[PDB]
Amino acid sequence: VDAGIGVMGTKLGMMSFFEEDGTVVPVTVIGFKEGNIVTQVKTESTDGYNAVQVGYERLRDRKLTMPERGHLNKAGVIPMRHLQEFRLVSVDDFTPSQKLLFEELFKEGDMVDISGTTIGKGFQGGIKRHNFKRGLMTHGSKSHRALGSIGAGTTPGHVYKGKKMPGRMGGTKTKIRKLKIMKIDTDLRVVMIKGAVPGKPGNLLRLAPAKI
Amino acid sequence: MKHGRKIHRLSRPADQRRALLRGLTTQLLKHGRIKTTRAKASAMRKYVDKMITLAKEGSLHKRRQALGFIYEKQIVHALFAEVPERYGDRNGGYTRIIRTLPRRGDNAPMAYIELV
Amino acid sequence: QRVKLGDIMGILNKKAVHAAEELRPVPGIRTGDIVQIRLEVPENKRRLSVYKGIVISRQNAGIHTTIRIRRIIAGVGVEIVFPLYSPNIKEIKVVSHRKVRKARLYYLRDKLPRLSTF
Amino acid sequence: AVPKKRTSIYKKRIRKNIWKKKGYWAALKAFSLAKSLSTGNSKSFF
Amino acid sequence: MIQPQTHLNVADNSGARELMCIRIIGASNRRYARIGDVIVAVIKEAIPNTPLERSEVIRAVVVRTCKELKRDNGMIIRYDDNAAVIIDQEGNPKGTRIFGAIARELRQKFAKIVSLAPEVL
RNA sequence: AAGGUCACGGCGAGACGAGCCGUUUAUCAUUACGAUAGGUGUCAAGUGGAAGUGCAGUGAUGUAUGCAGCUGAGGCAUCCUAACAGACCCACAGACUUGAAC
RNA sequence: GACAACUCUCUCUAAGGAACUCGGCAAAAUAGCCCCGUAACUUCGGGAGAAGGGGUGCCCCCUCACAAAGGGGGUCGAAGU
RNA sequence: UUCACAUCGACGGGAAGGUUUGGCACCUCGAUGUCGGCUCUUCGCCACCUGGGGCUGUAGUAUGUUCCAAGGGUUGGGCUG
RNA sequence: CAUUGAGAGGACCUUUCCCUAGUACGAGAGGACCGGGAAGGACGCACCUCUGGUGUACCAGUUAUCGUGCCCACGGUAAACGCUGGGUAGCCAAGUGCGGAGCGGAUAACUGCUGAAAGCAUCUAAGUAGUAAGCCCACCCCAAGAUGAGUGCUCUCCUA
């Protein structure tokens, strides 16, 4: 349950905003490829919960299959790629018919949370996944960087599940929390936000207000 | 991880890879059409586009860098007398990567380089 | 009247440098110059701090086009970084020029300090 | 490292048939390439 | 970055020359001592006309460092040596004349070091 | 059939499978989509003054051309090259039984 | 082909410098020729290349045992066995 | 200072645990590789700290002892294998 | 495609300094509980805007030598850079941001409120209140192979 509808935007590099007091803050720059049109609302009557379903990245019709574009043309909106809802408490007033919601709702709310696919690092070891220590690099040692002991002795007879092994590190989404908003641009369709979003410039990014 | 490392390294070390690039683009400029593997094909594509457009502006500095890159002496001087008369107005894209059957003994994906 | 692409690094950075140039003019600091920095720090009431020194590098990334500066204070070896587009500076003055054959004077840190006193 | 016992006919016919089914998957690709190698304007196979 | 086996020069005329600093107080990191962190120094060598001899545990203040110093104004200050001031726990040192320049953020906790300093940058 | 898979051009994804983004009269015009990768043209950016010539010097070398010359893993533009040619899987109201109204 | 973990053979590493460790193990550092200078001790043979410090590339000139070599000067590089 | 039970508690008594040294020799010697260190767990509470409380010979700070509570933490070093 | 979430993981940690206030208390000396703020430490999730390490894409200086006929200028080699000087994009931290919230639920120890079995009493036998870093929920992610296999929207089943 979220405390309100959010938007989604793409990361476009990082820079530094110079505050007129004299400080230098590192900000991430957020663009918006297409407006976050509310496509499908799911209320308490026809569904077990209440959520507002928006989308993103208007595309060519060849890029989008028949169930997708049939679902989007059921709402009478543009064919678009990305599609996510926000679960919201039952006080909502949202029509699914082409609500091109403008981005003014976050500037006075100087706290926002963001979610995104972090950059994947592939099958990485235990020295960087779970912040282990390496063995002795010298003094006749042989267990350089290795995983060390894995379990206890005879009495378990196995290893505990969830034990810290090497595996695929990045690729899942994360949410970093309470990130204070900064100078929006009402003509450059760009929002400064002081922090570090998950991922390189180009990826999708959930931008939804806080849950404290 | 290889995020954004756009060098195309082969199954050979660095200086041997440089010699493979120079020799195979040299004999590519000698015969025109050539049989490579596909990694060697794209690795020829970047450098031989650099060597067609290098002696496109036939000065002395371009001719000396171009003679420094290519092995054979008499093929650089057969190049700038040929590339403005042929590959003017093309503005990039000097090759073609026509693929063929894999190689007997390796199942190596084998390609074939033109000049067009 | 044109909509803009995903090339917003250059136009946010370009209009940021153009706004900071509209506020105060700045002549360019090449590597090897001997310059002055006049800094605004509150509550000191002198409002013009003295920073003489030799620019070592210029790590120019748009709005962080910066100065690696060096002056031997009477103890030893002070190496200060300056953002040229910050509102905390007041003016720059290119006093001299060493005419050095290098873009990065990181050798000059640990040399003999008679060749580093501004 | 040294195997404690041996495998059955069961598990071995499973693993060998996964190996040969992995050989099955790389010939409908060869049927597609052999079918595109036939009469048609394709910019490959000089 | 001041490890617990570093040599710091003296920034005053208290009576020492350098010191092996031992195991910082305050910030419990103790493998990264930035500015303003007091250190439990021991005297490696000293001036032999002063009641500060060899092998004497004392408390001092890191006032210069080769590691950088991130400021909010955009500047980054760094020195070429490491320096400490032989300090007492009630503020002021027992050496008056401070050698070398210091920064100005440590004025908010150590004002006597700034007031006795030749340059405050 | 809808939708996938192979192939194809790759990736900020990745041991292999995966995943993701393309797969072309690859806009036309009044204002967000139909540039995937390489090349090319420019712009950030790195090293930092290239060759050749002239001048000064007995010569090492310095100087003008000339923030020039190379690099261009990054941004934008450009269809010049390769995205051609295909192939294959999945089809044909979704068993049997009760209740409701039509 | 690809450019995962991890082993091995190498290169570099901000700040510190043995805090690691059974133990400076291993790596890093010194390194060639000339000049200055060199202690405790001793079987007076040595230690000793003790330690420690300076020059070193390339172009000029002259002194020239008229082959090695010397001094003075300039020239570049961050760095000259 | 009075005062067995704020706190220790002599002379004695009753238990729990299986973490020391022991007793037996019950599995294992056609092989269950001891002590310390590195790496990496996880668990117990007989609680060192953190959270709540009682009593205090607790004026306050700091305590002494004790109840609930094992979520989390429990340093860097000189000596020695 | 879009999610609910049964179940499971991670995170729920901790210290000084300041106001209250040199106030209660104490002859003085000393010096609060409670409620806020600020700076840290470890841990974790990210990122490369700054500062760097590396960066065998790179460019620059130079030694020995072999080629390019020769001077210039280049190329090869001195392992898997000849040795150095810097560096874009990646990766990383020492760097940069963020997190650890809850007059939410029930409790353990305890303090209670009425209050009887013994017309006195007693936290309890009926009912009930404050309250723990502990339990659960909320917090971030995976998640219907949850065979109990969910829910919602949309596309397609044609010819003989």
PDB file of N, CA, C and O in Angstrom, chain A residues 52-80:
ATOM      1  N   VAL A  52      -3.934   2.133  -9.284  1.00  0.00           N
ATOM      2  CA  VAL A  52      -3.998   2.947 -10.492  1.00  0.00           C
ATOM      3  C   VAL A  52      -2.866   2.530 -11.425  1.00  0.00           C
ATOM      4  O   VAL A  52      -1.689   2.540 -11.041  1.00  0.00           O
ATOM      5  N   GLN A  53      -3.227   2.157 -12.650  1.00  0.00           N
ATOM      6  CA  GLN A  53      -2.309   1.519 -13.587  1.00  0.00           C
ATOM      7  C   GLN A  53      -1.934   2.500 -14.688  1.00  0.00           C
ATOM      8  O   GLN A  53      -2.752   2.810 -15.563  1.00  0.00           O
ATOM      9  N   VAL A  54      -0.691   2.967 -14.639  1.00  0.00           N
ATOM     10  CA  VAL A  54      -0.164   3.913 -15.597  1.00  0.00           C
ATOM     11  C   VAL A  54       0.810   3.197 -16.523  1.00  0.00           C
ATOM     12  O   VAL A  54       1.167   2.041 -16.314  1.00  0.00           O
ATOM     13  N   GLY A  55       1.255   3.898 -17.566  1.00  0.00           N
ATOM     14  CA  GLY A  55       2.213   3.357 -18.507  1.00  0.00           C
ATOM     15  C   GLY A  55       3.149   4.436 -19.015  1.00  0.00           C
ATOM     16  O   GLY A  55       3.129   5.570 -18.534  1.00  0.00           O
ATOM     17  N   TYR A  56       3.944   4.074 -20.023  1.00  0.00           N
ATOM     18  CA  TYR A  56       5.108   4.875 -20.389  1.00  0.00           C
ATOM     19  C   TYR A  56       5.635   4.387 -21.736  1.00  0.00           C
ATOM     20  O   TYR A  56       5.337   3.266 -22.159  1.00  0.00           O
ATOM     21  N   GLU A  57       6.415   5.251 -22.404  1.00  0.00           N
ATOM     22  CA  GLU A  57       7.112   4.968 -23.672  1.00  0.00           C
ATOM     23  C   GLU A  57       6.152   4.589 -24.806  1.00  0.00           C
ATOM     24  O   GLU A  57       6.038   3.425 -25.198  1.00  0.00           O
ATOM     25  N   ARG A  58       5.421   5.606 -25.270  1.00  0.00           N
ATOM     26  CA  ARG A  58       4.717   5.553 -26.552  1.00  0.00           C
ATOM     27  C   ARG A  58       5.629   5.065 -27.675  1.00  0.00           C
ATOM     28  O   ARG A  58       6.755   5.542 -27.828  1.00  0.00           O
ATOM     29  N   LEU A  59       5.136   4.104 -28.460  1.00  0.00           N
ATOM     30  CA  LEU A  59       5.943   3.428 -29.465  1.00  0.00           C
ATOM     31  C   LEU A  59       5.196   3.282 -30.783  1.00  0.00           C
ATOM     32  O   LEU A  59       4.084   3.784 -30.965  1.00  0.00           O
ATOM     33  N   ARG A  60       5.850   2.576 -31.703  1.00  0.00           N
ATOM     34  CA  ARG A  60       5.226   2.126 -32.939  1.00  0.00           C
ATOM     35  C   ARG A  60       4.393   0.875 -32.667  1.00  0.00           C
ATOM     36  O   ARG A  60       4.688   0.092 -31.761  1.00  0.00           O
ATOM     37  N   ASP A  61       3.329   0.699 -33.459  1.00  0.00           N
ATOM     38  CA  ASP A  61       2.389  -0.398 -33.249  1.00  0.00           C
ATOM     39  C   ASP A  61       2.994  -1.758 -33.582  1.00  0.00           C
ATOM     40  O   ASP A  61       2.508  -2.782 -33.090  1.00  0.00           O
ATOM     41  N   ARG A  62       4.037  -1.793 -34.420  1.00  0.00           N
ATOM     42  CA  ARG A  62       4.724  -3.052 -34.700  1.00  0.00           C
ATOM     43  C   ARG A  62       5.473  -3.570 -33.481  1.00  0.00           C
ATOM     44  O   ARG A  62       5.690  -4.781 -33.354  1.00  0.00           O
ATOM     45  N   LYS A  63       5.870  -2.678 -32.572  1.00  0.00           N
ATOM     46  CA  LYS A  63       6.636  -3.050 -31.390  1.00  0.00           C
ATOM     47  C   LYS A  63       5.794  -3.723 -30.319  1.00  0.00           C
ATOM     48  O   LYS A  63       6.352  -4.176 -29.314  1.00  0.00           O
ATOM     49  N   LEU A  64       4.480  -3.799 -30.503  1.00  0.00           N
ATOM     50  CA  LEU A  64       3.551  -4.125 -29.434  1.00  0.00           C
ATOM     51  C   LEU A  64       2.583  -5.180 -29.950  1.00  0.00           C
ATOM     52  O   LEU A  64       2.064  -5.052 -31.063  1.00  0.00           O
ATOM     53  N   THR A  65       2.342  -6.217 -29.151  1.00  0.00           N
ATOM     54  CA  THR A  65       1.566  -7.352 -29.627  1.00  0.00           C
ATOM     55  C   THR A  65       0.066  -7.062 -29.561  1.00  0.00           C
ATOM     56  O   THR A  65      -0.374  -6.013 -29.083  1.00  0.00           O
ATOM     57  N   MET A  66      -0.719  -8.017 -30.061  1.00  0.00           N
ATOM     58  CA  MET A  66      -2.174  -7.865 -30.082  1.00  0.00           C
ATOM     59  C   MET A  66      -2.850  -7.832 -28.706  1.00  0.00           C
ATOM     60  O   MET A  66      -3.784  -7.026 -28.552  1.00  0.00           O
ATOM     61  N   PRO A  67      -2.489  -8.653 -27.698  1.00  0.00           N
ATOM     62  CA  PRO A  67      -3.141  -8.461 -26.387  1.00  0.00           C
ATOM     63  C   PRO A  67      -2.745  -7.173 -25.695  1.00  0.00           C
ATOM     64  O   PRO A  67      -3.575  -6.565 -25.005  1.00  0.00           O
ATOM     65  N   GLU A  68      -1.490  -6.751 -25.858  1.00  0.00           N
ATOM     66  CA  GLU A  68      -1.015  -5.502 -25.273  1.00  0.00           C
ATOM     67  C   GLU A  68      -1.754  -4.307 -25.860  1.00  0.00           C
ATOM     68  O   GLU A  68      -2.336  -3.493 -25.133  1.00  0.00           O
ATOM     69  N   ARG A  69      -1.746  -4.198 -27.191  1.00  0.00           N
ATOM     70  CA  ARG A  69      -2.353  -3.052 -27.854  1.00  0.00           C
ATOM     71  C   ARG A  69      -3.874  -3.114 -27.790  1.00  0.00           C
ATOM     72  O   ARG A  69      -4.537  -2.073 -27.825  1.00  0.00           O
ATOM     73  N   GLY A  70      -4.446  -4.313 -27.677  1.00  0.00           N
ATOM     74  CA  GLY A  70      -5.874  -4.410 -27.425  1.00  0.00           C
ATOM     75  C   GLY A  70      -6.239  -3.946 -26.028  1.00  0.00           C
ATOM     76  O   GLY A  70      -7.280  -3.308 -25.826  1.00  0.00           O
ATOM     77  N   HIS A  71      -5.381  -4.247 -25.048  1.00  0.00           N
ATOM     78  CA  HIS A  71      -5.588  -3.748 -23.692  1.00  0.00           C
ATOM     79  C   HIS A  71      -5.441  -2.234 -23.619  1.00  0.00           C
ATOM     80  O   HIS A  71      -6.179  -1.571 -22.883  1.00  0.00           O
ATOM     81  N   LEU A  72      -4.500  -1.667 -24.375  1.00  0.00           N
ATOM     82  CA  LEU A  72      -4.306  -0.221 -24.325  1.00  0.00           C
ATOM     83  C   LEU A  72      -5.392   0.515 -25.099  1.00  0.00           C
ATOM     84  O   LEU A  72      -5.838   1.587 -24.678  1.00  0.00           O
ATOM     85  N   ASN A  73      -5.840  -0.043 -26.223  1.00  0.00           N
ATOM     86  CA  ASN A  73      -6.956   0.551 -26.948  1.00  0.00           C
ATOM     87  C   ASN A  73      -8.311   0.241 -26.326  1.00  0.00           C
ATOM     88  O   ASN A  73      -9.318   0.787 -26.786  1.00  0.00           O
ATOM     89  N   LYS A  74      -8.367  -0.616 -25.303  1.00  0.00           N
ATOM     90  CA  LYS A  74      -9.589  -0.710 -24.509  1.00  0.00           C
ATOM     91  C   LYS A  74      -9.807   0.559 -23.693  1.00  0.00           C
ATOM     92  O   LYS A  74     -10.954   0.928 -23.415  1.00  0.00           O
ATOM     93  N   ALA A  75      -8.726   1.238 -23.309  1.00  0.00           N
ATOM     94  CA  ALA A  75      -8.803   2.498 -22.584  1.00  0.00           C
ATOM     95  C   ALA A  75      -8.859   3.713 -23.498  1.00  0.00           C
ATOM     96  O   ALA A  75      -9.053   4.829 -23.005  1.00  0.00           O
ATOM     97  N   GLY A  76      -8.697   3.528 -24.804  1.00  0.00           N
ATOM     98  CA  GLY A  76      -8.703   4.645 -25.732  1.00  0.00           C
ATOM     99  C   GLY A  76      -7.496   5.553 -25.620  1.00  0.00           C
ATOM    100  O   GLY A  76      -7.634   6.776 -25.743  1.00  0.00           O
ATOM    101  N   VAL A  77      -6.313   4.985 -25.388  1.00  0.00           N
ATOM    102  CA  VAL A  77      -5.093   5.771 -25.239  1.00  0.00           C
ATOM    103  C   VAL A  77      -4.084   5.356 -26.299  1.00  0.00           C
ATOM    104  O   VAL A  77      -4.363   4.498 -27.143  1.00  0.00           O
ATOM    105  N   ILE A  78      -2.908   5.973 -26.258  1.00  0.00           N
ATOM    106  CA  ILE A  78      -1.818   5.710 -27.192  1.00  0.00           C
ATOM    107  C   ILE A  78      -1.177   4.362 -26.883  1.00  0.00           C
ATOM    108  O   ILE A  78      -1.197   3.915 -25.727  1.00  0.00           O
ATOM    109  N   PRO A  79      -0.638   3.659 -27.883  1.00  0.00           N
ATOM    110  CA  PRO A  79       0.093   2.408 -27.622  1.00  0.00           C
ATOM    111  C   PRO A  79       1.461   2.698 -27.019  1.00  0.00           C
ATOM    112  O   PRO A  79       2.265   3.428 -27.602  1.00  0.00           O
ATOM    113  N   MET A  80       1.726   2.114 -25.851  1.00  0.00           N
ATOM    114  CA  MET A  80       2.898   2.429 -25.049  1.00  0.00           C
ATOM    115  C   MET A  80       3.521   1.151 -24.498  1.00  0.00           C
ATOM    116  O   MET A  80       2.851   0.125 -24.353  1.00  0.00           O
TER     117      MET A  80
END
